[PDB]
């Protein structure tokens, strides 16, 4: 699918993703903190439709992501990200998507998630995160 | 004067300052690189006029600042920045302002200047820089 | 188990762990790079014995670890780290221990594993890694 790279910012304020309960994660778009002021990133859309959107508004300064978990698996010959979940210091934004395949989890003990990059076609093919202090 | 803080970015692409040959540095405004795309910062103007503008366009990826030098001194009871000069890996953007008072220089051996903060009234009262890898 | 924390150094030269094909990883020690000079970390021993030793000598500057994989599982009630495999740019130091339970994997796209921390009772209970540029 089409690769994307948001880059590095000051923090995260809101995450907006999409999913399908029988396939995988679809759309992905995050609004970052750029030195105090929000900065909305490019909307990375899927090649198709029929996804259920999710808007994750964090209490910016005080609430930040502590762990990112999910599942990768093959759906129709394409190994993609099927589920994604964000746990913060205040709440857990429950498993979105199908919780099947092989697991992964990135807990941060000291550091902050500061940016996103990855790829999206019909579903989210892959993704990586930028970390900082 | 009025304090300002641009914050941290990915790099610098252009610096736009102003000076008076008999007083000190006046206006200050920089356009940064925010993950590949330029980002123009807020224009920090002086309380007064009659300054000679300077536009410093760097060859972004390839040309970056290696040292920042200048002079601080008192001009009319106000200790301000009287001169400022930026030397890059390709050129020296010669002393702008009055080269009188006490000197300072910040050479970077490994690192990049990534943001600016300081204060401006009639002249640039002070300033600090954000460094990164 | 007993908590340890080696800290952060400049790089990694060698890793000496211990395992058992039916239980999990036991002993754990690592000799780091400290500004171009080897630095032998403390030996974090298991409370019991009967493990098989493995020495992982990297070609220090040239060879560096790019991804750490493993398994977290339940043995004797305790959830511990059952397997561990290190993938460097030159070779893969094959899985040690039991590849059974919940998988975890950290691929590093930009950065270095620069230190370790964790806990060891009879087996490695958990660990964490310091990441640097």
């Amino acid at each position: 699918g089409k690769a994307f790279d948001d880059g590095a910012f000051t923090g995260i304020r809101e995450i907006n993703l999409s999913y399908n309960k029988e396939t995988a994660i679809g759309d992905f778009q995050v609004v970052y903190d750029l030195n105090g002021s929000p900065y909305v990133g490019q909307n990375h859309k899927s090649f198709i439709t029929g996804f259920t959107p999710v808007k994750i508004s964090l209490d910016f300064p005080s609430e930040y992501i502590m762990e990112v978990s999910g599942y990768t698996g093959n759906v129709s010959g394409y190994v993609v990200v099927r589920s994604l979940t964000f746990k913060t210091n205040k709440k857990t934004y429950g498993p979105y998507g199908v919780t099947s395949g092989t697991p992964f989890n990135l807990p941060i003990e000291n550091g902050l998630i500061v940016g996103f990059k990855g790829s999206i076609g019909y579903w989210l093919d892959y993704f990586s995160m930028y970390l900082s202090l | 004067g009025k304090a300002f803080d641009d914050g941290a970015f990915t790099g610098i692409r252009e610096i736009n300052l102003s000076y008076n040959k008999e007083t000190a540095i006046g206006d200050f405004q920089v356009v940064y690189d925010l993950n590949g795309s330029p980002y123009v910062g807020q224009n920090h103007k002086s309380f007064i006029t009659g300054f000679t503008p300077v536009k410093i366009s760097l060859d972004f990826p390839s040309e970056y600042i290696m040292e920042v030098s200048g002079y601080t001194g008192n001009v009319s009871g106000y200790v301000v920045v009287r001169s400022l000069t930026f030397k890059t890996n390709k050129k020296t953007y010669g002393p702008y302002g009055v080269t009188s008072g006490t000197p300072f220089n910040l050479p970077i051996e490994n690192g990049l200047i990534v943001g600016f903060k300081g204060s401006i009234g009639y002249w640039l009262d002070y300033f600090s820089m954000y460094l990164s890898l | 188990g007993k908590a340890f924390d080696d800290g952060a150094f400049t790089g990694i030269r060698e890793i000496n762990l211990s395992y058992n094909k039916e239980t999990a990883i036991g002993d754990f020690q690592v000799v780091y790079d400290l500004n171009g000079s080897p630095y032998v970390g403390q030996n974090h021993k298991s409370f019991i014995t009967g493990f098989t030793p493995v020495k992982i000598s990297l070609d220090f500057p040239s060879e560096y670890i790019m991804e750490v994989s493993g398994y977290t599982g339940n043995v004797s009630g305790y959830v511990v780290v059952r397997s561990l495999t290190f993938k460097t740019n030159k070779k893969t130091y094959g899985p040690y221990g039991v590849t059974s339970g919940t998988p975890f994997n950290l691929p590093i796209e930009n950065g270095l594993i620069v230190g370790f921390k964790g806990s060891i009772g009879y087996w490695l209970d958990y660990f964490s890694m310091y990441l640097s540029l």
Partner: peptide, 15 residues
Amino acid sequence: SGKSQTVIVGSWGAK
């Protein structure tokens, strides 16, 4: 050089 760098982790999904 010229561009800032940060630790980027992963690439979870398609190899």
